[PDB]
Design a protein around this ligand. Sequence first.
Ligand SMILES: Cc1ncc(COP(=O)(O)O)c(CN)c1O
Ligand SMILES: Cc1ncc(COP(=O)(O)O)c(CN)c1O
Ligand SMILES: [Cl-]
Ligand SMILES: [Cl-]
Lengths: 425, 425
Amino acid sequence: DVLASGEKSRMLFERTKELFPGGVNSPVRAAVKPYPFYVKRGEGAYLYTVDGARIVDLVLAYGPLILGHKHPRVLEAVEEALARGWLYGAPGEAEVLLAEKILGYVKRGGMIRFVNSGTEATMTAIRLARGYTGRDLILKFDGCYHGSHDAVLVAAGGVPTSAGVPEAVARLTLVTPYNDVEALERVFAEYGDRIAGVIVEPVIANAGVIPPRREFLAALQRLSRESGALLILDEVVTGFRLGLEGAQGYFNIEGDIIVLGKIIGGGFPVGAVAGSREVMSLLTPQGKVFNAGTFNAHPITMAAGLATLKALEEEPVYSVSREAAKALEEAASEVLDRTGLPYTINRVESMMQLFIGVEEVSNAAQARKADKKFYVKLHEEMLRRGVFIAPSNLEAVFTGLPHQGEALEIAVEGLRSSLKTVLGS
Amino acid sequence: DVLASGEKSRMLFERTKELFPGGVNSPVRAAVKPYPFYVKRGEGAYLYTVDGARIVDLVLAYGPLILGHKHPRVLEAVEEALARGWLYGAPGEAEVLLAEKILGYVKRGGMIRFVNSGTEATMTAIRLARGYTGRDLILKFDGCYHGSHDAVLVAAGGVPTSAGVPEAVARLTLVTPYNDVEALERVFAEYGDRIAGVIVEPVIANAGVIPPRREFLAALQRLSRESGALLILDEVVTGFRLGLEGAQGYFNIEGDIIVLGKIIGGGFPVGAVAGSREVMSLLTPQGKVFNAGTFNAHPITMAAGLATLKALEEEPVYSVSREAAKALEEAASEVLDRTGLPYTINRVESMMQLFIGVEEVSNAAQARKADKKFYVKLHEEMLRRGVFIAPSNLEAVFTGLPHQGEALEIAVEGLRSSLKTVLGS
Ligand SMILES: Cc1ncc(COP(=O)(O)O)c(CN)c1O
Ligand SMILES: Cc1ncc(COP(=O)(O)O)c(CN)c1O
Ligand SMILES: [Cl-]
Ligand SMILES: [Cl-]
């Protein structure tokens, strides 16, 4: 009953094929079925296509929009900051207030460095772990996504998963299965003091959603501590979504370097690296680890981020978002439970994902066994119901403050009905 | 007669020492004398400190603000775009119009990919040159700045100029002197078909300002063409500053991959890579060279960039900016010419820099011979005159549209008077 990609979108779609590689500026955007819809504007829980169709947004730009689109509070803060100019080339005030608030939640007494993307952030964290330890090796886990830079575009043979990445760079990155304590202990017994740092997502969000095993978390902290390797918690997604204290507070764990992003920018380009004074002091202009950026601590990003965190402390964002995701899971379960089809749903607060054909998903290997065809059809049916979920089973479904009342009702009805349609396909 | 860093700035300065490494979020910001001033807001040609002092901005965030601060046209475009939401997670309309306009000026019939910083942009261009050719080596020039990523944090022994950068990565980058035809031809005769690409700034902006020799430019195009290596013109600064067609149109040259940034974002986080369909088609989701980004083609950046380019085509920005820089050069020359002090001033349109103690600066080595102490004192005196120039002699002085009338008068008077003071110091 809804046509997300209409004739206006069709025109733009054929038109951008000549302007951008693959027709888009980011891979995941091209997978939308039957073809990408173009957005005219966004507000609250909705995206509005150039043709006019209104769509409930369960993607939220893949994490940043926990407050929904064009949040009134953040909008007003940004409007006010805008009247003061948006770029200075020197220190501003908002960056100071945001740093203090962020550090108060993720690394009290530590320091922070603001960058412009999660990619720049994890890239900076890695260079920092190498500079601090004097080691080269970085350990990452299969299924974890850390951005668009050489060091993390690697898989176990360490070989490049993208072209243009020298074999020499790829060899310096190790890879083992997520949640695999056995393998984790083995790789450390195999490389020991040559490992500079261990980067990991406390909760995987780029291979569907996958919660961590308590033993995996404990092993990570213990092994990095005993070997001298820095534990890098990539909280670009988990930061400020799993509560104000993020993954560290949620799972009661500690990281040496905390990578932040998306939510802390209020919807504007952002990335950040936080750590103790001992580690952070290595960054230029204080130490030898280089990091610079024309847009670092961009005034508008700072202002939007501060307002966003302010809203997270004053509004029932976490409860509302948790309830929305819970309601979606219950709706999907109510329909699927009336079948003989195996499946599983992983959910951590406001982030979740459905996996068809398997009863358990505790790692990327299992996540990859899920029925892709079923999911893709589900994605398409949902759009036809006016609901937008990631076009890929390996992405995640995110809920936010606006997912309540009518918007939630539409999403829930859409999910029930889309499942039934796909089930009877 | 002006105190840029007052008591409000002093408080913030001591306060941020505990929040950020070196007290700032980007190295160059810490060099401001006697210590960094904090900005409350910016408008037109001015920056306003938290204490209140108004300062003429000859830094302009180091390039992006060719239209000055809070340009009315760009402001209104951004306000309107803001009301439509600032982040979608799917394609928007502004990105399409900006891509078409940019490509029409720098690579007709080609493609483009929007990223979030110049660093991400040059990093993407390099990975693209390596993926396209299947080669590893990248040639850069001494004094050129390409961002905060491993591959370009290198110098000739290729060794790392920053900590945390593996020797293996650094060895894959070659470095020779800027404008040195002899050395350029030699390195190609030494590495030949192993070179994936040659990255260079058509006009150096991060070792003072240094124009290119016509022979250097010709050799670059010829050698890359004959060896199969891609010529990567880093126009993050030159793009849209040296005319709408940038360096290519200004010097009548051609690059395989054009790196863009700063101005194309209208003051918001941005970066871009442009090239022919043959090369660009390698980027994901079309090809194997990976590049993704949550904020790629950010709606506000797109809207601000489009409005900015629109202003560049409709307003006398280039003539006004050229005249301002010319007036500053004449004022500095009028004072210095009445002395027996050797010096030289390099200027290309709206970008320039003064070099004391040397009669010529055609490369970074010479630029490094300039009197740093004189410059630093000049920087401080200027601030005391209410004018802001880079605190480092290796940075550049940029002029923009607002540099006219009273603002220009203040800058010119400040320069004359600051020179005299330093000369009599
Ligand atoms: C030529 C060039 N390339 C890359 C960069 C880095 O741009 P960004 O700081 O946005 O990463 C700069 C900024 N100094 C630059 O001038
Ligand atoms: C955990 C994680 N790290 C890094 C990134 C990349 O962030 P960005 O796209 O802004 O570079 C993402 C975004 N998918 C992420 O989820
Ligand atoms: Cl929005
Ligand atoms: Cl501004």
